[model samples]
Target: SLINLKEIEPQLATDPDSAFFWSGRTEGVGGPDVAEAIAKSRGGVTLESTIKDKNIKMPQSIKAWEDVSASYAKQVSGEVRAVVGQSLREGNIWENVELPRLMGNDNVTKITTIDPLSQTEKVIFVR
Candidate 1:
């Protein structure tokens, strides 16, 4: 039986991609990945990003952060803030103290470790 989508918490958009036959693949954000996007109506276009090329130096701002996360919320399964906020907090974050420590943790169910090599906090969601 497949791991039902409903059974896997809709914390973020990291679904469909993470849930699998236990398959594997090859895969960032320099400053951040989900910087946000646009709209012109009651439900317009939401610009979601994954930062194809981080070393290029894109728009770096908290405002952009809000919009980037906002775009994902509109695109994903839940509220923008809720999804993005949880993605940041629920994962192996805290680059200063905890991130490095959590790196040693092999418990997959508890920690939202997106990238074993390191990545943005926004990398954990499904959308």
Candidate 2:
């Protein structure tokens, strides 16, 4: 049966490209392939290689870390913060560390992420 994104998670429904697939892992952030697609379409976005903040340690278990941060870093100069693969899983680093760091940035006026399976871009945050 097809996963109802709107029912399972509201953020996932923000995806406009249908990036996510039902046959794979649906938890946490998307993979690098998704990032590449988003970057190419969005004018060469950059992913994060390391978590610059000293307070937050990088999550080793996460996939496609490089592409995730790079996407936002490249867009940081603007009012838009394009986060390609942010996760909403509870009790994880993504929820505890990454999301806060990304959302807390003063420069970020808007935030977005891609649904890996559906290949869709979702607007997760804005102010």
Candidate 3:
């Protein structure tokens, strides 16, 4: 599940090598846990693919983003990570630290159908 999308840097997705930023990025080993989450469950993760690509937004359900991140946190980090509710709202992992992480950038996913068959969520990072 370690996508490491080289193109979509998070500074946008990069740390200017600042320990401060890197520390947050690596907080609670998110660096590694995300690796596992990507490998273990990173599929079917969607965009509002039903909507035309030109128009996409974060899912309508706030809790859906929280729950989806929580699901991935548990699967990868073994518990909910922490605060940054706004981060989750912005379609990022709500780590208690300075910033959050992304499998994709904001407004790119919808949980779609949470099928019991799959298991815990963040189930895919589908483009």
Cα miss at 35, model 3 (Å)? 12
Q: Write the per-residue lDDT of candidate 2 for residues 62-122, one digit (tens) a residue.
A: 4334334323332243333233333433444444444565466565566555555555666
Top TM-score prediction, candidate number: 2
TM-score-best of 2 and 3:
2
Could you give the C-alpha RMSD of every candidate to the true structure, in order shown? Answer: 15.8, 13.7, 16.3
Kindly state the number of residue pairs that clash in model 3: 10
Global lDDT for candidate 1?
Answer: 0.26
Clashing pairs in 3: 1-38, 1-39, 9-12, 9-13, 10-13, 10-14, 11-14, 43-124, 45-124, 45-126
- Residue range with the least summed lDDT across 10 consecutive positions in model 2: 14-23
List lDDT for all candidates, in order.
Answer: 0.26, 0.39, 0.26
> What's the TM-score of each model vs. the native?
0.23, 0.43, 0.21
Evaluate model 3: give its TM-score: 0.21
Candidate 3: list runs displaced more than 4 Å. Answer: 1-60, 77-93, 96-127
lDDT of 1 by residue, 6-98 (tens): 322232232221211000111222112222221111132222233221221225354443433332232232212111222233222243233
Model 3 alpha-carbon miss at residue 2, Å:
28
Superior candidate under TM-score, 1 versus 3: 1
